[PDB]
């Protein structure tokens, strides 16, 4: 829905494997307009 309404914003997913979330975690080392997350993480 971030893509459908106004796609301009820099959106980060944050789900799945430790390796995949680690790859994204290092991006926020601003161009991170939202991160999409869940409470267990």
């Amino acid at each position: 829905e971030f893509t459908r309404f106004v796609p301009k914003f820099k959106v980060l997913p944050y789900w799945g494997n430790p390796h995949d979330r680690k790859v994204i975690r290092r991006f926020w080392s601003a161009p991170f307009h939202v991160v999409i997350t869940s409470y267990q993480l």
Binding site: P13, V23, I24, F27
Partner: peptide, 29 residues
């Protein structure tokens, strides 16, 4: 003498961001 150290600096400076961004573009779909 520093140029051989500088060419190593610029190629790794692009390779760093390149691989991370390439993985980002493969990931998000």
């Amino acid at each position: 003498l520093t140029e051989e150290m500088l060419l190593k600096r610029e190629e790794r400076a692009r390779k760093r961001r390149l691989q991370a961004a390439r993985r980002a573009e493969e990931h998000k779909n």
